[PDB]
Design a protein around this ligand. Structure first.
Ligand SMILES: O=c1[nH]cnc2c1ncn2[C@@H]1O[C@H](COP(=O)(O)O)[C@@H](O)[C@H]1O
Ligand SMILES: O=c1[nH]cnc2c1ncn2[C@@H]1O[C@H](COP(=O)(O)O)[C@@H](O)[C@H]1O
Ligand SMILES: *Cc1c(COP(=O)(O)O)cnc(C)c1O
Ligand SMILES: *Cc1c(COP(=O)(O)O)cnc(C)c1O
Lengths: 406, 406
């Protein structure tokens, strides 16, 4: 259908779990932006699969996993993920137009982070996107032709010369990078395809397509909490730029929202709770950089739902809240005496206004609406009424099957 | 509705004309990407309006013109456009999240162009987008607070120091840029708004929104003829990233296609015709850098229609073809003995396969389907059948009113 799964907060909402849970019903599962800054996590029958760039349809061999054109690819790292699975040939395809992360990029990221202090993943995501905007970047299809690759590498070496000292590239950068591609190009080349053509066709034939967002909406380069964002567009619309699909192809948009909020890295966080009331969240939800913890923020949620056109919500990680005395929800902002109901473009001086809810004790592992505590259902009802989007999926532990459908 | 007007070739298709022609029927007209690399041109009653970043609803005072968040803004240049119109306050709004083009950017563009030779507009578009990906860029909202602006300017000056020689910035860069903002910030600040909120609301209230693409689909940074592209996403999906609108809000997608093709700048162009058969196109269609001229390319058109989800086409500049003996249409590609029907990701060795059509003599200024020569209608019929999208608008001169609706 091109349905889309999107994180509607600042990442870590539980996207990997939801994609894995529904992927069996699709022909294609598509990672459309970001890189291995992502960590989409699947748990099933006590086995944890930590994915980075590998799409989250990988546990269903009939699914075709697509890494689309707006992604940035650390080839070595993707090769390491490929090696963990059997017979990925014919069920993983990497866009020939995806951009390639070089070691300069990670070094540059660390260098710039000394002044900017965004809290990046230090994986060179941003600098890879920069080179894409410069139109100097290498793309996956370049690896298919030794002569083209060699030429682009020589232009890169020439271009980075003035930076070797600053970014601490070392004496052997150029020989090391040559050898890198000698090692990894043969490993990844069989998977490189025109995925744009592939998805245009699939859409035309009415095959079922699931688009897997990374990061989350409030990390969007344009509309998120800039400059405390990633360098890619994270919303549902981005899925129908990366891919070849058009906006009219988008059917369901599933907004993945944790039952509380996190950020990892710096930047504004209106509902962050550094008081003892937040300590439960830290104990069970901070954890690898520990996440900043706080409450669900309906102001921000409503904003993200509008940006994405969510048709349904998945409410994630209810089990983290088990045992908490009370749950707060940020229902509005106070800014110097004004009540704000709408998410503003600058969060300066925005203080959360909270409603308090009774906690629950034992959502963990519940598989039926009937088996949930009243206080859980009361919370769900409040959220979906305030936001105006039905909660259709409820996750009660990391396990694939600990998921309730409505 | 959020309808979208998109250029489905490499720019210069006649977008400005179509937006101006239909804008009276909308509440909002939104420029969603690019900058003053654009030149959307309107002619009405013998007056030519050359727009660059100003949206093409400006001649209808009841329209609200929006410059959205994914645009890059040369403030001085926008101020110069503002000064050509009366009472723009309350009918032009500039996103507080739009990025700001600095003089370093244009210089950097010219510097890099010595090695890359893309054929950019040398307006610093690409380097502005680079700084956006770096998350070091200045945005329009920063101009609203003198202290914030001063801080970002000081970080910029520190960051550009190693480049002053290379990019030939000059002794007085820093004092000149300080004075620039002293001059232009007061002029532009009244127009700076949260346009994301504004369009979310308008969409919720069912107000009519027209989204005005710049450049064209084959210039898209991800899916166009990389590296001979612009540094922004140009398709209909990009309109529902920049803006706050979601993909489900998109209704009509009007693909603007010239009756022949141009490119300006370097890069692949399968249907380019440098033979005498193309000379008519050059005489009447090259013209300020002259455009490379060639034939309509249905392979590329079908690709762009899929990317955008076009619901209708506008066929533009029929008058340029008046007097030509014969018109060719590229219906497929030959690549080393293989017939390709689908646009590939690499145009190496793709040679056009042509069908030839009889020309016409006097489409210029015709306002009724009935008054068109048969050979014009035969061409239209062929195009819309091969592409599978109805031609609903036909332009027979630059003049607003020389437009036929079906
Ligand atoms: O998967 C993710 N989860 C949470 N935050 C992320 C993720 N990927 C990137 N980020 C955040 O996005 C911002 C930019 O990091 P970058 O994507 O490495 O440039 C930082 O705040 C990161 O911590
Ligand atoms: O309005 C436009 N018309 C046609 N080509 C454009 C336009 N804007 C940018 N381009 C082209 O897009 C490419 C990149 O230019 P840039 O947008 O200045 O970086 C070049 O091929 C330009 O000639
Ligand atoms: C849930 C969670 C993840 C995984 O979430 P995705 O959206 O699948 O990336 C990662 N880290 C933390 C701390 C989490 O709570
Ligand atoms: C038509 C045309 C333009 C204007 O087209 P837009 O899509 O409005 O930018 C500019 N230059 C040339 C050569 C043209 O033919």
């Amino acid at each position: 259908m091109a349905d889309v799964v999107v994180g509607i907060q600042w990442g870590d909402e539980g996207k990997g779990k939801i994609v894995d849970r529904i992927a069996k019903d699709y022909d294609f599962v598509v990672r459309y932006q970001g890189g291995h800054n992502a960590g989409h996590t699947i748990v099933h029958k006590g086995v944890k699969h930590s994915l980075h760039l590998m799409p989250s349809g990988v546990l269903y061999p009939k699914c075709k996993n697509i890494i689309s054109s707006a992604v940035v690819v650390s080839v070595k790292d993707l090769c390491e993920e490929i090696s963990a699975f059997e017979d990925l040939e014919n069920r993983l395809f990497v866009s020939d137009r995806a951009h390639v992360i070089l070691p300069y990029h990670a070094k540059k990221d660390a260098f710039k982070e000394k002044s900017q202090n965004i809290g990046t993943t230090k994986k060179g995501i941003g600098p890879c996107y920069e080179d894409k905007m410069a139109r100097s970047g290498i793309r996956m299809g370049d690896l298919l032709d030794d002569k083209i690759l060699e030429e682009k590498l020589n232009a890169h070496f020439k271009a980075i010369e003035p930076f070797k000292k600053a970014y601490d590239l070392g004496e052997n950068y150029e020989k090391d990078l040559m050898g890198y591609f000698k090692t990894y190009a043969p490993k990844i080349c069989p998977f490189i395809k025109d995925t744009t053509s592939m998805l245009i066709e699939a859409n035309q034939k009415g095959e079922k397509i699931l688009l897997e967002g990374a990061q989350g909406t409030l990390l969007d380069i344009d509309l998120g909490t800039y400059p405390f964002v990633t360098s890619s567009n994270t919303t549902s619309a981005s899925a129908c730029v990366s891919t070849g699909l058009n906006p009219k192809a988008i059917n369901e948009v599933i907004g993945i929202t944790k039952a509380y909020s996190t950020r990892v890295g710096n930047g504004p966080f209106p509902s962050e709770d550094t008081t003892p009331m937040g300590d439960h969240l830290r104990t069970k939800g901070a954890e690898k950089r520990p996440r900043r913890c706080g409450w669900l923020d309906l102001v921000a949620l409503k904003y993200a739902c509008a940006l994405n056109g969510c048709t349904q919500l998945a409410l994630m990680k209810l089990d983290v809240l088990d045992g908490i005395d009370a749950i707060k929800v940020c229902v509005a902002y106070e800014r110097k005496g004004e009540r704000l109901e709408i998410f503003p473009s600058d969060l300066k001086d925005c203080v959360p206004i909270y409603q308090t809810f009774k906690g629950w004790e034992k959502s963990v592992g519940v598989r039926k609406l009937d088996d949930l505590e009243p206080n859980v259902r009361e919370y769900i009802r409040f959220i979906e009424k305030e936001v105006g989007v039905k909660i259709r999926l409820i996750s009660t532990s990391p396990e694939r099957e600990d998921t309730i459908f409505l």
